[PDB]
């Protein structure tokens, strides 16, 4: 039978097509994933039909609930048998999910509107001018909160009580913060992000220092899954070969509209 | 049961103390992998043997016998339980032993002697007066035999045809001849061993441009082992608690002897 995939709409690794509406099927889609979803089902001698989380989240478990939602939730629901997206490996998700080793890595970075005069961490951490913060819930907030490096401790103490808020509802208000706020605002956010965001119209916005963590993003199917064995070879084949590298070139660089 | 762990003489990641020969078990060593191994043992509960390969070798497969050695060997084998080092997740070893998620991620990159008016792959590709070369039989060879890169490929062609050869026996002549050679080679190698080398004295050298490509050392067991569940949650959450980057920097920078730049 088709192995059902699940995938989030997160540009660049799946994307409606301009014409989707003339569409049908997994030609509907475009992106990173998209291709990524074919070399692999390519390299298992797998049919698949690409589906969107039906709720639109990576994956989380309600503290009181105890309930998984995103992709997450539809592989350990039985909704769904393999997510193929920008899902990053976490040891909470690792506990019920089994993952690929990492197709693509990343870490926490800076994202300034262009004119603005930072360049690290270190730079943020000194002054309080241009005004700094994470989305308001998640990783990239825990990782500030729990350091005991001191340049992050320092930042820590300044976004958990500085005025306005600097902590944003979704990656896309800190993205259009950054945009919007006249070079005052700086963004910490996902590196991949950065460099994509970094590459769109209207080529605004670039990221700046050194990534300040190491993570990485996976392919997920359930435990005991008789797909879980042949992906991960394949990850590793397609790194070898060049392919991931290659994919991410075509969908961050060649397909860039700033220069 | 004590778990026997299986691991390599590498610097940084173990190295005998100097007062060893009065030490016994692991108290011999030290070193971000000593480290790591402690760190592992207790997360997962166990206790443990550190053990250096007699082979002195990470795990190949020999072409003509077929049979595995170093590291993956002793893992294949039935004589170690689980290896830690820098091990290489690659395809052809994960078909053989399991690994955990990456605890260090690295790639191909450029050793320079200091002042060598070099910043990438593309400016060695685009010159002459300065040679280049890899290890002569590994990885790092075959990633520019294969390479449909247009910039990798041309280094490729020239390299395979240099004269005097420009590959090496060992890492650490690949290192020497970057040293000795007054600016005219340079070395591509991976980028642990290139950030650790720059760290090192005299100080003479260091990495240049962004990485080749993308890989990762992960913690190895024997397919099926029942300790390699426990092991990889264990390396995903020394990660996300920082333990990771703090044994990095201890071992390169803390300890390194050349400042920072």
């Known amino acids: 039978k088709t192995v059902v995939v699940t995938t989030i709409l997160e540009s660049p690794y799946v994307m409606m097509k301009k014409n989707h509406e003339m569409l049908e099927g997994n030609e509907r889609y475009e992106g990173y994933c998209v291709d990524l979803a074919a070399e692999i089902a390519k390299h298992c001698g797998f049919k698949y039909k690409l589906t ?37 490996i976490t040891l909470v998700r690792e506990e019920v999910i089994d993952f690929s080793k990492p197709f693509m890595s990343l870490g926490i970075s800076i994202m300034i509107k262009k004119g603005t005069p930072i360049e690290s961490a270190e730079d943020l951490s000194k002054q309080t001018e241009i005004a700094y913060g994470t989305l308001d819930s998640g990783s990239t907030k825990e990782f500030f909160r729990r350091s005991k490096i001191a340049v992050f401790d320092k930042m820590w103490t300044y976004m958990r009580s500085a005025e306005p808020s600097v902590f944003v509802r979704t990656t896309a208000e800190g993205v259009a913060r950054v945009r919007k706020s006249k070079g005052k ?25 050194g990534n300040l963590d190491s993570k990485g993003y996976g392919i997920a199917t359930p435990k005991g899954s008789s797909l879980g064995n042949a992906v991960n070879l394949a990850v590793l084949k397609l790194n ?7 994919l991410k070139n075509k969908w961050w660089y060649d397909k860039g509209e700033c220069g």
């Open 240 to 246: 070898e070969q060049g392919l991931l590298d290659k």
């Open 52 to 88: 969107i989380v039906g709720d639109g989240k990576y994956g989380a478990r309600d503290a009181d609930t105890k309930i998984w939602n995103g992709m997450v939730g539809e592989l350990v629901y039985g909704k769904a048998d393999i997510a193929i997206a920008p899902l990053t």
């Open 185 to 209: 605002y700086a963004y910490l956010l996902e590196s991949t992000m950065n460099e994509y965001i970094e590459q769109r119209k209207p080529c605004d916005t670039m990221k700046v220092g």
